[PDB]
Design a protein around this ligand. Structure first.
Ligand SMILES: Nc1ncnc2c1ncn2[C@@H]1O[C@H](COP(=O)(O)OP(=O)(O)OP(=O)(O)O)[C@@H](O)[C@H]1O
Lengths: 285, 6, 280
């Protein structure tokens, strides 16, 4: 596996650590080796290695934002940002665990967890109005049109005729979405990437991980993720508390939310994660 | 501003 | 009532559902620090530190955006009695004894060099320069406080020796090249252990931070860990020229007097006695 094939480099970065004790998260461009206090991004290709200098820069910009929580801090030297290519990138590991929706059935838990999502999203939103953040992050145009193309090209071949018809319904509204580039947008803000410390009392937001898809874009993408994971009522509490419950925002969220499983399937398809592809394609084959 | 001998 | 009971409205807001009597409060020169599982709440202990706290927050935000190869306390929330919530850096100080093992020493010295290089580079950034204290005459101020406040407590030979140490000190260049932690003692450097060899988790206690001379941080390392270890760091980082060795020696020889000057203003009698050992 990746751990085996990269034992020598890992023995340097994590000296004395048994590499069989590590785990790996699959990414589009890099494989991520998870240690106790840090993670190591390993480029899967020469292209992937040439993107790490900019990823270093991006993670440094994120580590400077006021989000009310932690992010993976780059553990390289600043001069790694000026390199053509890096063979690895080490990041601090955000502690904590994902939150089961079950907890949100107690309504004080729900209020306190919604309030902390709002601080995060509000911080991401204001960072997106900042010209220096804007300059350091990607901001693709026409992403919804192109995403629809990418689904049709990469996922439809894996779908039943019924699945394809359902996907077409969901991809329908995408061409009419306004193309909003106003917030820092995590882009994969499912519950597994938002980590909590729940030992001492009510759930407290430790931090956020997996920023591979980060951009300047539409805040509705991140709220859609939340809604996809936690359902209507919890989403409505976040929108109320954040001041985002208007009809325009809510309609964009509904449109994006209906594509969210397809987003997960498209990512799993490009990063080789078989289980995540099977999950994402639930009901489309 | 060394405290306690540092 | 305790500090915990007294501050309890703010704690239930910041730490919803956390039993206050289960927390711990460490004290410092300026701040009462409530210690929770993954964060601390800094509270001013004076009217002076309540006014300075916004600026301290701003400084911590800058530090959180540097490339030092490790963590720093990240500001998570600030407010007005002002408070500042910071991430808690995990790990523990390294016992000097761990440096007996030469493989541990190499790895630890390597991680110190990364940190010090990061601090050095960071001092060349106009923005950091713009956000961080860069005092001029930091040592002449020191020398005057020592003569004023400590000489009256000292023997004639004590005063003679101190005078020699302050002279050396007045001959140092007023270098402002690096971000200088200012108090980089062992207890301010935390490690992850028991997962192979020690890995630098992060650095805390940035109240003394400035743009300054990095010899101050190297001197602090040598005071905590000794001369073989500091020689290792100086050699690995390419800092073992004699001009650097002079600055390090000059600064280190002030460490007893700095402790005594603090313990004088504190009313701490044991620190004052320890600081003044051999000066009376
Ligand atoms: N970010 C942190 N992570 C972990 N422990 C911390 C952190 N900040 C403070 N502490 C703990 O609290 C103690 C007191 O905090 P600190 O040393 O920063 O005091 P201070 O009064 O703010 O500083 P100073 O005396 O330099 O003005 C530390 O010795 C340490 O045990």
């Amino acid at each position: 596996g990746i751990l085996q094939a990269n034992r020598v480099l890992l023995s340097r970065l994590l000296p004395g650590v048994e590499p069989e004790g590590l785990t790996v998260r699959h990414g589009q461009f890099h494989q991520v080796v998870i240690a106790s206090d840090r993670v190591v991004c390993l480029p899967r290709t020469a292209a992937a290695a040439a993107r790490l200098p900019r990823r270093a820069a991006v993670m440094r910009v994120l580590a400077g934002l006021d989000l009310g929580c932690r992010t993976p801090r780059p553990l390289c030297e600043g001069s790694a940002e000026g390199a053509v290519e890096l063979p690895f990138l080490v990041l601090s590991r955000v502690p904590g665990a994902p939150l089961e929706a079950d907890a949100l059935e107690d309504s004080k838990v729900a209020e306190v967890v919604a309030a902390q999502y709002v601080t995060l999203l509000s911080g991401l939103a204001s960072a997106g109005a900042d010209e220096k953040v804007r300059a350091a992050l990607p901001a693709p145009q026409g992403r919804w049109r192109q995403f629809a193309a990418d689904v049709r090209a990469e996922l439809f071949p894996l779908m039943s005729d019924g699945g394809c018809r359902q996907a077409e319904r969901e991809l329908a509204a995408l061409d009419s979405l306004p193309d909003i580039t106003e917030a820092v947008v995590h882009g994969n803000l499912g519950a597994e990437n938002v980590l909590w410390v729940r030992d001492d009392g009510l759930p407290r937001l430790s931090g956020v991980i997996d920023w591979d898809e980060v951009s300047i874009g539409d805040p509705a993408e991140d709220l859609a993720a939340i809604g996809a994971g936690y359902g209507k009522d919890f989403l409505d509490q976040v929108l109320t508390l954040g001041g985002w419950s208007d009809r325009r925002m809510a309609t964009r969220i509904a449109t994006i939310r209906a594509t969210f499983a397809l987003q997960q399937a498209l990512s799993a398809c490009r990063d080789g994660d078989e289980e995540e592809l099977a999950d994402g394609l639930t009901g489309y084959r | 501003k060394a405290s306690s001998x540092a």
